[PDB]
Amino acid sequence: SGIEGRPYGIQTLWTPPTSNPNCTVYTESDSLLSLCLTKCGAHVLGSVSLTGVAGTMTNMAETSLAIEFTFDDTGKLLHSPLVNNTFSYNALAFMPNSTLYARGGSGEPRNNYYVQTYLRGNVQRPITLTVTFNSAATGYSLSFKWTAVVREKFAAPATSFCYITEQ
Amino acid sequence: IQTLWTPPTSNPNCTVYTESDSLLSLCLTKCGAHVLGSVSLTGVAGTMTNMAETSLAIEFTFDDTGKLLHSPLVNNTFSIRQYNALAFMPNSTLYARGGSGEPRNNYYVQTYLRGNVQRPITLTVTFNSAATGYSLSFKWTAVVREKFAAPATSFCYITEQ
Amino acid sequence: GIQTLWTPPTSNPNCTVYTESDSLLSLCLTKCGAHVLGSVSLTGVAGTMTNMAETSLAIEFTFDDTGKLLHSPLVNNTFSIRQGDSPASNPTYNALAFMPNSTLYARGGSGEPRNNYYVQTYLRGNVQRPITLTVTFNSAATGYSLSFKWTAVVREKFAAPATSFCYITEQ
Ligand SMILES: CO[C@]1(C(=O)O)C[C@H](O)[C@@H](NC(C)=O)[C@H]([C@H](O)[C@H](O)CO)O1
Ligand SMILES: CO[C@]1(C(=O)O)C[C@H](O)[C@@H](NC(C)=O)[C@H]([C@H](O)[C@H](O)CO)O1
Ligand SMILES: N[C@@H](CCC(=O)O)C(=O)O
């Protein structure tokens, strides 16, 4: 399964650790994504990183890259960039709170969490990760947008973020 | 009890300059000896939408039992989500009282004013600046004659108990 | 009940970077599901830590393949479970539940971007002196490790403010 849930009853939702690409940004299996969401009271503590492995991911054409995990209003996964687009518990306990992070609110500052990091861990390549909560007009979502450098390989190091949950 | 928060809301709940001029989110969740905290602050009325100063500070102060004494919230809404208060207070050995100036009492966050990439700002979260009891202080950079809004951010500190 | 590995909060130097007890380190790791939430800060107290000779400073905690601590910069290696989190004498715990995942953060992988977590902060909290903390997972070729490297300013005191980071665990 692409996203899997693990007990403390479910306390972790993650992409299982892998040594191989598990994600499709531009072409199939072109990248290795880690995404892990763990519940701590009203918070989800999230970690994310994304390593380019093949194709355009190793020779970027654009100055940013975005992916999104979208869920319906019950918290069921609808879509993700994962090669294994599947899921295998109260899902709303992991969804971003829709009162605080209003649906369709990507333009609202409080729906966005900004992280400074460095492309490929190179300090001469500062980039910014924007994590957005509930950009989707219905249901729930988590969006990740990183800046990038054209004609260079993409890799975003380990990062983390936190949001308040729906339940 | 794992969470202390101001409950999620979409209407103003906070008073920085005038009553109910802003929407504050502050949530503290306990994970062992840590509190994981999140905060954001959105201006909605008055000077918060047309700033007069280039920084904005708010503070939550608590007594030596962990009871809230003062905050900028319009109503007494900082509460247990629907208990030992000291398990949520910043550790007073590591973060000495009256320690606003001590580096280890301060936690820095980089963000962007109104999420605008031309407006990088710093948030300084300070533990136990108060001379007695406990405190959490937040100070953000701002730009005069512009609206203030600080995006979602987070921080982490070690607890007293 | 055991959720925390730490060096205890103290007001006295507890750490040796260049000379014995020259610094005050805080390091605390708390488990939340498949994550560790970590906090760290480092304050120079004496000697070269108050008058730096180099432009970066690094310390490392190494562990064996069971998660047992092998080396650290702490005087007497005072890094263990938080007292009072269990009523049992000599409480047991799964140390691998605190170790950085070795599939995601491969051993000897310090050159791999996903093994590194970058934090911006300010030297001595002076906002004119931005510095970068690099936390590296499993740099060591064997066992597990957490490495911390801060940039520094020569001929000045070193102190890094409160910071935090997060990684996925082995178990
Ligand atoms: C003397 O100038 C400074 C410094 O060292 O650069 C300015 C800096 O903003 C300040 N840090 C904070 C968090 O206030 C620091 C501490 O007060 C001092 O290091 C404590 O000993 O003093
Ligand atoms: C070629 O130089 C660089 C790069 O890519 O810019 C420098 C950068 O500091 C380094 N990152 C780290 C964490 O060391 C990176 C990786 O080692 C390499 O990309 C992995 O394949 O190599
Ligand atoms: N120096 C502080 C107290 C000790 C500290 O902050 O470390 C004060 O003058 O209140």
Numbering used by the authors:
A (entry chain C): 170 to 177, 193 to 272, 285 to 363
B (entry chain B): 194 to 275, 285 to 363
C (entry chain A): 193 to 363
The study reports:
Most HAdVs are equipped with twelve protruding fiber proteins that mediate attachment to host cell receptor molecules. Unlike most other HAdVs, this virus contains two different fiber proteins, a long and a short one, a feature shared only with the two members of species HAdV-F (HAdV-40 and -41). We find that the long fiber binds to a protein-based receptor known as the coxsackievirus and adenovirus receptor (CAR), and that the short fiber binds to glycoproteins that contain sialic acid-capped glycans. Similar to all other known AdV fiber knob structures the 52SFK has a nine-stranded antiparallel β-sandwich fold and forms a stable trimer in solution.
In order to define the interactions of the HAdV-52 fiber with sialic acid, we solved the crystal structure of 52SFK in complex with 2-O-methyl-sialic acid (a stereochemically uniform analogue of sialic acid) at a resolution of 1.65 Å. The three shallow sialic acid binding sites of 52SFK are formed at the contact site of two neighboring monomers by the EG and GH loops at the side of the short fiber knob domain. Two of the three binding sites are partially blocked by crystal contacts, and therefore the structure contains only one fully occupied sialic acid, while a second sialic acid is visible with partial occupancy in one of the two partially blocked binding sites. The bound 2-O-methyl-sialic acid is well defined by electron density and engages the 52SFK mainly through contacts between the sugar’s carboxylate group and the side chains of R316 and N318. The bidentate salt bridge formed by R316 is a prominent binding motif among glycan binding viruses. In addition, the backbone carbonyl oxygens of R316, G317, and G303 form hydrogen bonds with the sialic acid O4, N-acetyl and glycerol-like functions, respectively. The tripeptide R316-G317-N318 located on the GH loop forms a hook-shaped motif (RGN motif) that is contributing most of the interactions, and that therefore largely defines the specificity of SFK52 for sialic acid. Mutating either R316 or N318 to alanine, replacing the R316 side chain with a negatively charged glutamate, or introducing a steric clash (and a polar clash, introducing a charge) at position 308 (N308E) all abolished the attachment of 52SFK to Pro-5 and A549 cells. The sugar’s O2 function, to which additional sugars would be attached in a glycan chain, is pointing away from the protein and towards the tip of the knob, suggesting that more complex glycan receptors that bind the knob with their sialic acid caps would have to face towards the capsid in order to be bound by the virus. The mode of interaction between 52SFK and its sialylated receptors is fundamentally different, both in location on the protein and in contacts formed to the ligand, from the known interactions between HAdV-37 fiber knob and sialic acid.
